[PDB]
Amino acid sequence: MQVILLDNVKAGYARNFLVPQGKAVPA
Amino acid sequence: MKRTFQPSVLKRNRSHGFRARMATKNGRQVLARRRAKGRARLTVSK
Amino acid sequence: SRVCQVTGKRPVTGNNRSHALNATKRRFLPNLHSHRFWVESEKRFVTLRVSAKGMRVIDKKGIDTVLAELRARGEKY
RNA sequence: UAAGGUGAUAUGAACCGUUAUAACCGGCGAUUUCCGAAUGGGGAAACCCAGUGUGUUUCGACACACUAUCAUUAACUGAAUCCAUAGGUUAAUGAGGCGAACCGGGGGAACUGAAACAUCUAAGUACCCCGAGGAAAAGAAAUCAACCGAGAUUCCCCCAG
RNA sequence: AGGGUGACAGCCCCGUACACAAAAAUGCACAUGCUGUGAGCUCGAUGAGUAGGGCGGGACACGUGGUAUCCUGUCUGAAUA
RNA sequence: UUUUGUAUAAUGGGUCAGCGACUUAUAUUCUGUAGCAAGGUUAACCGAAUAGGGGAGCCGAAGGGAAACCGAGUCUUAACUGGGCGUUAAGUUGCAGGGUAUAGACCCGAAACCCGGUGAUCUAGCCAUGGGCAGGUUGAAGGUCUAACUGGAGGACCGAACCGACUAAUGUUGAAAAAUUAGCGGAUGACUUGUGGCUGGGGGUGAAAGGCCAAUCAAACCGGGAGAUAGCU
RNA sequence: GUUUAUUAAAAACACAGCACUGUGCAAACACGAAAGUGGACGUAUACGGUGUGACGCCUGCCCGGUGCCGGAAGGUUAAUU
RNA sequence: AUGUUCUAACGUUGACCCGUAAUCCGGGUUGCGGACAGUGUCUGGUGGGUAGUUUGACUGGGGCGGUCU
Ligand SMILES: [K+]
Ligand SMILES: [K+]
Ligand SMILES: [K+]
Ligand SMILES: [K+]
Ligand SMILES: [K+]
Ligand SMILES: [K+]
Ligand SMILES: [K+]
Ligand SMILES: [K+]
Ligand SMILES: [K+]
Ligand SMILES: [K+]
Ligand SMILES: [K+]
Ligand SMILES: [K+]
Ligand SMILES: [K+]
Ligand SMILES: [K+]
Ligand SMILES: [K+]
Ligand SMILES: [K+]
Ligand SMILES: [K+]
Ligand SMILES: [K+]
Ligand SMILES: [K+]
Ligand SMILES: [Mg+2]
Ligand SMILES: [Mg+2]
Ligand SMILES: [Mg+2]
Ligand SMILES: [Mg+2]
Ligand SMILES: [Mg+2]
Ligand SMILES: [Mg+2]
Ligand SMILES: [Mg+2]
Ligand SMILES: [Mg+2]
Ligand SMILES: [Mg+2]
Ligand SMILES: [Mg+2]
Ligand SMILES: [Mg+2]
Ligand SMILES: [Mg+2]
Ligand SMILES: [Mg+2]
Ligand SMILES: [Mg+2]
Ligand SMILES: [Mg+2]
Ligand SMILES: [Mg+2]
Ligand SMILES: [Mg+2]
Ligand SMILES: [Mg+2]
Ligand SMILES: [Mg+2]
Ligand SMILES: [Mg+2]
Ligand SMILES: [Mg+2]
Ligand SMILES: [Mg+2]
Ligand SMILES: [Mg+2]
Ligand SMILES: [Mg+2]
Ligand SMILES: [Mg+2]
Ligand SMILES: [Mg+2]
Ligand SMILES: [Mg+2]
Ligand SMILES: [Mg+2]
Ligand SMILES: [Mg+2]
Ligand SMILES: [Mg+2]
Ligand SMILES: [Mg+2]
Ligand SMILES: [Mg+2]
Ligand SMILES: [Mg+2]
Ligand SMILES: [Mg+2]
Ligand SMILES: [Mg+2]
Ligand SMILES: [Mg+2]
Ligand SMILES: [Mg+2]
Ligand SMILES: [Mg+2]
Ligand SMILES: [Mg+2]
Ligand SMILES: [Mg+2]
């Protein structure tokens, strides 16, 4: 899953941590 | 000797009465069949 | 019921087939999971019962678009 | 429309009417108990018991209307929890139940045939379930054809056992 | 036509052919008012967890067969004139 | 009727009256008959039309070969002296009939299998809430190692009600689709009983007999698949 | 005590007692496509299953077969790739 | 590819708060587990627990024996 770091990953890393914690958003 | 029919009006009405028939879809189908046949007495109630 | 809230995937029927081609009825169930989705626009978690396929749909389309579809179908969340 | 009439078994009684409110026929209205989706709560159907509001009362009571549930929408209110959201309340709109077939969909046998039987058959039939309409469904080519062409869907006869 | 009448009726009776009729409600087909629906013309645009694939099933007259095509429970996954 | 064979003491029929079994549809073949004839005939449909239109088709006038293909021939084979099938028999459409096919397919008849319902008012187990057990015995623990006295245990004892059902006789088109009479077992308990409740059919329940689940049980009843199928009578 | 209501009441079933065995609790186990519910508002001195059947004296030898329990060197072996 | 650690998916039939008159359910807070468990699809094993069935004929009755070209 492509993400923009705000602070390619496994979909679960994005879905359940990075995006909810406000650390990234999808590309 | 004790025979099979031992009448109780309360048990009769609870087992087979109008409201017992109306309480389930299959009981309502009984009433629909008996209305379609043209029964004078739909249930044991009356 | 075993229904994906995103895709509407539900149990379908088919056959088990033996080596001797004996057919017995079976079901195929969706790969359903209850999952808490972060909805940034509401600052809230929304739990959906979703197929694994529905989770890929959410990843692609985004949770806001999917929940918009859910509201317009009368699908309560 | 009328010289007759008050449905039947079914006579009688007491009457109504004969130039037009006798009766009879048709249109539109009025009335329309109780049970039943039954909907104010309950219930062993045709019963038992309420709340609220008006109005009447001769103080004993009395009448009438409203009060189900769900969905949607709107307003107001409103947690854990800050904003909130869930929740709550009221109003409006709709639904609900029934019905022979036909129709679309979700499920789906077995006997039987195979001269046994398991693949296969019976058959996507019977049956159960959901939903609709006067019909339904389908439908305007990511279709066929064969280098020539056709031009959505549906139904009938062929092609062909 | 048909039915009735004390046996079998064109002319006894009720009808029948034919010719007419609506205060009221209502179907329909027109015409003409009114509310919303908004024609036409240049210029774009052209349906993605989709098509396709692997696994399991089902549907196609077609039983997996050398098996196209359709549907999809599961895992994937394009090009987009 | 069935049989090698029936007066047969094999089957069926008490009698009468009424009803009761080779059908229908569509395909296909053959026969008869009618029409037309190297042709015959139309289907749906159009038509107010039993008319008329409609020849899409179908059958026939050519076969041989697996086929390409060739064609009164063709196939076989490298090729036939040959050999196989063909060539010198009129068909076709109605109408009637015989047979066949698919359909319940001459009629009646299973035991069963499947699907959806109805049933625990009988009975089995359980749940809740009420009731019942005359009369008479025995004398545990305990109490005040043994004595007296006291005490009142028990799936304890004898025995009515009550619950059962061991034996015999009767009855067996019964008084009764399970009883009556004389005797018999339990009778404070793992007891018995009223009312109500719960468990549902490959399911229940069973101190277990395949017992019981409404006079039905090695898979209830009712309706449906259904005219199941029946090489049998 | 129980049993074949309606030809069997028994030596059959049950039984207290005994043993094996499972079960650490969201127990095993059972009814349920599931949610749940029983087990149990119990917790190994408990609960389920199995066999035996008061009590007394006892209960010998066999683990090759079939189960069950434990093991994991080696062989073989699925989808998948 | 195995192992440790982590928390954020997921589990909780621990505690507490709220909806709330509620021992269901949901939301919240927190503890404990934790990428395990569990579920879907696929797949090997096991599977009279359950189901559909098969289990020949001749024969001096049938069976047993014998036989079947
Ligand atoms: K079958
Ligand atoms: K057969
Ligand atoms: K006449
Ligand atoms: K796909
Ligand atoms: K004979
Ligand atoms: K005889
Ligand atoms: K014929
Ligand atoms: K002929
Ligand atoms: K020749
Ligand atoms: K002829
Ligand atoms: K026939
Ligand atoms: K049964
Ligand atoms: K006895
Ligand atoms: K052993
Ligand atoms: K937690
Ligand atoms: K896991
Ligand atoms: K088995
Ligand atoms: K012989
Ligand atoms: K003999
Ligand atoms: Mg009510
Ligand atoms: Mg009411
Ligand atoms: Mg409706
Ligand atoms: Mg057969
Ligand atoms: Mg339509
Ligand atoms: Mg072209
Ligand atoms: Mg006469
Ligand atoms: Mg397009
Ligand atoms: Mg395609
Ligand atoms: Mg695909
Ligand atoms: Mg393909
Ligand atoms: Mg495939
Ligand atoms: Mg297939
Ligand atoms: Mg003889
Ligand atoms: Mg003779
Ligand atoms: Mg003789
Ligand atoms: Mg004689
Ligand atoms: Mg005789
Ligand atoms: Mg005979
Ligand atoms: Mg006789
Ligand atoms: Mg030819
Ligand atoms: Mg005693
Ligand atoms: Mg008894
Ligand atoms: Mg006696
Ligand atoms: Mg005694
Ligand atoms: Mg006694
Ligand atoms: Mg036996
Ligand atoms: Mg019985
Ligand atoms: Mg059976
Ligand atoms: Mg049938
Ligand atoms: Mg029959
Ligand atoms: Mg005894
Ligand atoms: Mg007996
Ligand atoms: Mg006896
Ligand atoms: Mg529990
Ligand atoms: Mg024993
Ligand atoms: Mg078997
Ligand atoms: Mg069968
Ligand atoms: Mg058999
Ligand atoms: Mg034999």
Side-chain angles (χ1 to χ4, degrees):
Chain A
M1 175 154 225
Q2 297 295 137
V3 292
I4 301 187
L5 302 188
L6 302 182
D7 208 357
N8 194 57
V9 292
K10 289 188 181 67
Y13 192 23
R15 182 187 306 116
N16 300 316
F17 188 63
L18 293 179
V19 176
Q21 282 280 350
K23 294 198 67 183
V25 84
Chain B
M1 292 153 78
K2 189 187 199 167
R3 298 303 184 191
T4 56
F5 184 53
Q6 299 298 325
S8 162
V9 177
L10 177 61
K11 290 172 74 172
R12 186 163 188 72
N13 292 337
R14 287 181 174 172
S15 305
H16 313 294
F18 183 81
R19 293 182 61 72
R21 294 277 188 245
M22 289 296 294
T24 71
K25 79 92 173 162
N26 289 311
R28 293 185 300 261
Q29 277 166 352
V30 170
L31 297 180
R33 286 193 300 264
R34 293 178 73 80
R35 283 189 183 109
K37 201 181 186 190
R39 288 279 186 185
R41 299 162 204 69
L42 281 193
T43 71
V44 302
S45 301
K46 200 271 164 189
Chain C
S1 53
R2 295 185 176 102
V3 178
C4 175
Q5 293 189 266
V6 175
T7 62
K9 282 174 169 288
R10 61 171 55 235
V12 295
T13 62
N15 293 318
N16 301 298
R17 286 285 186 168
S18 64
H19 297 167
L21 273 65
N22 306 110
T24 50
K25 280 288 190 176
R26 66 165 294 179
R27 324 175 78 202
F28 296 83
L29 304 191
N31 184 19
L32 294 181
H33 300 281
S34 170
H35 190 269
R36 285 164 50 248
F37 290 95
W38 178 244
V39 49
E40 184 67 67
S41 305
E42 293 167 53
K43 301 300 297 186
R44 198 173 64 114
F45 280 101
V46 170
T47 304
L48 296 179
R49 194 178 190 185
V50 63
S51 55
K53 186 264 179 53
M55 292 179 81
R56 297 179 68 242
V57 170
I58 290 163
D59 292 0
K60 178 163 176 170
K61 294 193 188 174
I63 188 61
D64 286 69
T65 307
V66 169
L67 291 186
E69 297 161 3
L70 264 65
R71 293 196 298 287
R73 293 187 293 110
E75 183 62 58
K76 300 303 300 179
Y77 62 79

